[PDB]
């Protein structure tokens, strides 16, 4: 919010109709002029015969305007009926504008309602035989492009309501270079019908839609983003917006995403949604619930071929589209509907943060270089760590399990938190019951990363060993009543695991990444470098966590993961085991 956004006390006015933009940009004195409230007051007082059309200098910097409307009815109303009509008109319009702002501009509905219904100004035309007036909401300010977007909703509002004042809303005034007759001036020199100010607003300042004076009672918002039924059913199917899956349920394409019909039915929601892009002679018919259910039955009965879902393992789905792994391109729209994506990370993909440089990417490189130093000793461990974290972006079956082994305060939990903040809902934490002992396995479906945590040192007594039968069962592509296993399974260990039975099929499903960097307290820092289990000791950062849960490093780590994947798992994704690190496997070796 700048000074011009704060307010604009200088006004610009024309003197006739049809002035070319060349004259306006040439500040032609015969047509355009600049005034203030007081200057225009004496101008209109001294020269009533002139015609004055107030507008903006340009739409680039002064897009903020008071919300205004022009009502023109070819009739006359008595005072009491006029009051009833104006009350109904004001309640309907205030509601409609507030709802549009809430659903598009993301503003508070009640704030808009209060600001608009609290204070507004009405004009009055001297033409007795017609009811013509201009309504200006004093305290509500909005950018011009938002009004240009809202003209539609006002058009359907006018076409829908029965109130004559609301039915006679003139939406044509909402367009670039909009000029409105200033109250007190004639429409044309040959017409003697002018507009009259109304109480309690006795000041001319209350009758200009460009005069911006934002006070405590004001609110601001702007648009964030700059037989016949059978024919309707065929038209809907032509858009390829609804599909049948193998599970017997139908997936629909609403809000640029594929959803399930298992909830309250969505086919009807689609049918209402696409009534705008369809010819109006059918759009009239489409809005009765019985006919809409009839069209829905036709659509169900025309869908015979069942299409498999989630066929691409090399695509990362977001809630605003899908990202290609081989490329860095992001698709948002009909390019993403081609890939039948059912789940998503749950957050909008931001191209402004997915750049490469990032104000936080350097500190991310510091954090990753602290948790895993890029040294000649941390060379194979580091690349194994990179590949294991990269495998979480691919939606295919993973054939190996990696054990995250490290001592206390080695950054493993921060690593899980980075991974979850980077891939959204695609990372899930699972308990130890799937190892030592079934919702713990049924909601694992279509997940791309599953983590188990704090194994309670099974080497000592009072523990139920790993029983690698689970490891063999967690490697098969379909998990048992059946679910698709697309999840890289990672295990947190502070102590090396122990297994009851060791087989030749177990060395091919076990991987280990070692963590040996300690983030210690200043007081206990000394007692940190007398231990052989650490290679580097760094000061503990208490402010790191608070940054972590706030999704501060959400997109930089995603960029790192995709860049690693572009290096390692292209064109083939495979995880290789490293049996030579667990001592327990040395025995048979």
Q: Catalytic residues, which ones?
A: 170
| Closer residue to ligand AN2 in complex, CB, 162/532 | 532
Q: Does 75 bind its own copies (CB under 8 A)?
A: yes
Q: Does 390 bind ligand ANP (CB under 6 A)?
A: no
Of 456, 526, 533, 588, the one binding its own copies (CB under 8 A) is 456
| Closer residue to ligand AN2 in complex, CB, 213/407 | 407
For residue 502, CA distances in Å to 229, 401, 455, 506 come to 65, 15, 19, 6
Under 8 Å CB-to-CB from 129, ≥6 apart: which residues?
76
Q: What is the DSSP string of 198-229?
A: -TT--SGGGG-SS-EE--TT-EEE--S---HH
Compute the distance between CA of residue 33 and CA of residue 312 in angstroms, rounded to an integer. 62
Q: Does 581 bind its own copies (CB under 8 A)?
A: no
Q: Work out what residue 113 binds among ligand ANP, its own copies, ligand AN2, none; the CB cut-off runs from 5 to 8 Å by kind.
A: its own copies
Q: Does 277 bind ligand ANP (CB under 6 A)?
A: no
Q: Does 164 bind its own copies (CB under 8 A)?
A: yes
Compute the distance between CA of residue 529 and CA of residue 536 in angstroms, rounded to an integer. 8
| Closer residue to its own copies in complex, CB, 113/418 | 113
Tell me how far, at minimum, the Cβ of 574 lies from its own copies, in Å.
9
Of 391, 410, 421, 475, the one binding ligand ANP (CB under 6 A) is 410
Of 23, 91, 197, 544, the one binding its own copies (CB under 8 A) is 91
- 553, with CB counted inside 10 A (0-12, 13-18, 19+), is buried
| Closer residue to its own copies in complex, CB, 287/355 | 287
Tokens standing for residue 564: 């690693």
Of 273, 413, 432, 483, the one binding ligand ANP (CB under 6 A) is 413
Considering only residues 339 to 378 of the shown chain, the ones binding ligand ANP according to CB under 6 A are 367, 370-371
Q: Dihedrals φ, ψ of 116, to 5°?
A: -80, -50
Other beta carbons within 10 Å of 243: 18
Compute the distance between CA of residue 69 and CA of residue 209 in angstroms, rounded to an integer. 10
Tell me how far, at minimum, the Cβ of 540 lies from ligand AN2, in Å.
5
Comparing CA positions, the residue from 123, 302, 332, 327 lying closest to residue 225 is: 332
Tell me how far, at minimum, the Cβ of 423 lies from ligand ANP, in Å.
17
| Closer residue to its own copies in complex, CB, 11/422 | 422
Under 8 Å CB-to-CB from 572, ≥6 apart: which residues?
none
| Closer residue to its own copies in complex, CB, 362/454 | 454
Of 465, 472, 496, 563, the one binding its own copies (CB under 8 A) is 472
Tell me how far, at minimum, the Cβ of 547 lies from ligand ANP, in Å.
9
- Note the residues at the interface with ligand AN2 (CB under 6 A): 367, 370-371, 406, 408-414, 519, 538, 540-541, 544-545
Compute the distance between CA of residue 548 and CA of residue 553 in angstroms, rounded to an integer. 7
Footprint on this chain of ligand ANP (rule: CB under 6 A): 367, 370-371, 406, 408-414, 494, 504, 515, 519, 538, 540-541, 544-545
């Amino acid at each position: 919010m700048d000074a011009a956004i704060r307010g604009n006390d200088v006004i610009f006015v024309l003197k006739t109709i049809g002035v070319p933009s060349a004259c306006r940009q040439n500040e032609d004195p015969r047509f355009v002029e600049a005034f203030k409230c007081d200057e225009l007051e004496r101008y209109i007082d001294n020269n009533p015969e002139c015609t004055l059309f107030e507008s903006l200098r340009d739409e680039e910097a002064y897009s903020i305007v008071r919300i205004f409307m022009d009502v023109d009815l070819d009739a006359c109303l008595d005072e009491i009926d006029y009051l009833t009509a104006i009350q109904d008109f004001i309640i309907e319009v205030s509601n409609c504008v507030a709802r549009f702002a809430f659903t598009e501009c993301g503003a508070i509905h009640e704030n808009v309602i209060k600001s608009m219904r609290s204070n507004f100004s009405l004009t009055k035309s001297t033409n007795r035989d017609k009811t013509s007036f201009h309504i200006i909401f004093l305290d509500t300010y909005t950018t011009m492009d938002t009004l240009i977007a809202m003209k539609r909703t006002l058009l359907e509002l006018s076409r829908s309501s029965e109130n004559p004042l609301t039915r006679s809303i003139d939406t044509a005034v909402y367009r670039r270079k909009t000029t409105l007759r200033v109250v007190g001036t004639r429409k044309n020199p040959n017409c003697d019908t002018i507009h009259v100010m109304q109480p309690p607003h006795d000041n001319i300042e209350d009758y200009l839609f460009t005069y911006v004076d934002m006070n405590n009672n004001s609110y601001y918002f702007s648009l964030q983003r700059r037989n016949k039924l059978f024919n309707i059913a065929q038209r809907i199917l032509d858009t390829n917006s609804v599909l049948l899956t193998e599970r017997g349920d139908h997936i629909v394409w609403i809000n640029n995403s594929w959803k399930f019909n298992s909830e309250e039915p969505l086919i009807t929601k689609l049918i209402l949604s696409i009534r705008h892009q369809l010819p109006k002679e059918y759009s009239s018919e489409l809005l009765c619930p019985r006919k809409r259910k009839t069209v829905e039955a036709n659509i169900r009965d025309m869908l015979v071929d069942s299409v498999e879902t989630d066929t691409y393992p090399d695509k990362l789905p977001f809630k605003n589209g899908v990202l290609d792994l081989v490329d860095g391109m992001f698709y948002s729209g009909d390019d993403a509907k081609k890939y039948t994506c059912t789940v998503s990370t749950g957050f909008k993909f931001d191209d402004t943060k997915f750049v490469e440089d990032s104000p936080e990417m350097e500190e991310l490189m510091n954090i990753i270089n602290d948790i895993q130093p890029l040294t000649d000793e941390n060379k194979k461990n580091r690349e194994l760590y990179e590949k294991t974290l990269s495998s979480c972006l691919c939606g295919a079956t993973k054939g190996c399990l990696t054990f995250f082994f490290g001592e206390t305060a080695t950054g493993k939990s921060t690593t899980k938190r980075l991974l979850k903040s980077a891939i959204g809902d695609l990372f899930v934490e699972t308990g130890q019951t799937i190892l030592t002992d079934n919702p713990f396995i049924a909601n694992m479906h279509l997940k791309r990363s599953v983590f188990c945590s704090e194994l309670p040192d099974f080497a000592c007594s009072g523990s139920k060993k790993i029983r690698s039968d689970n490891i063999k069962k967690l490697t098969e592509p379909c998990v048992i009543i059946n679910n698709r296993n697309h999840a890289t399974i990672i295990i947190d260990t502070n102590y090396k695991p122990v297994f009851d039975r060791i087989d030749n099929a177990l060395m091919r499903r076990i991987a280990v990444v070692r963590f040996r960097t300690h983030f210690s307290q200043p007081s206990g820092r000394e007692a940190a470098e007398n231990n052989d289990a650490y290679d580097k000791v760094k000061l503990l950062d208490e402010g790191l966590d608070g940054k972590i849960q706030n999704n501060r490093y959400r997109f930089a780590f995603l960029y790192l993961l995709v860049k690693w994947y572009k290096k390692y798992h292209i064109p083939i994704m495979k995880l290789y085991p490293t049996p030579e690190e667990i001592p327990d496997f040395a025995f048979y070796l």
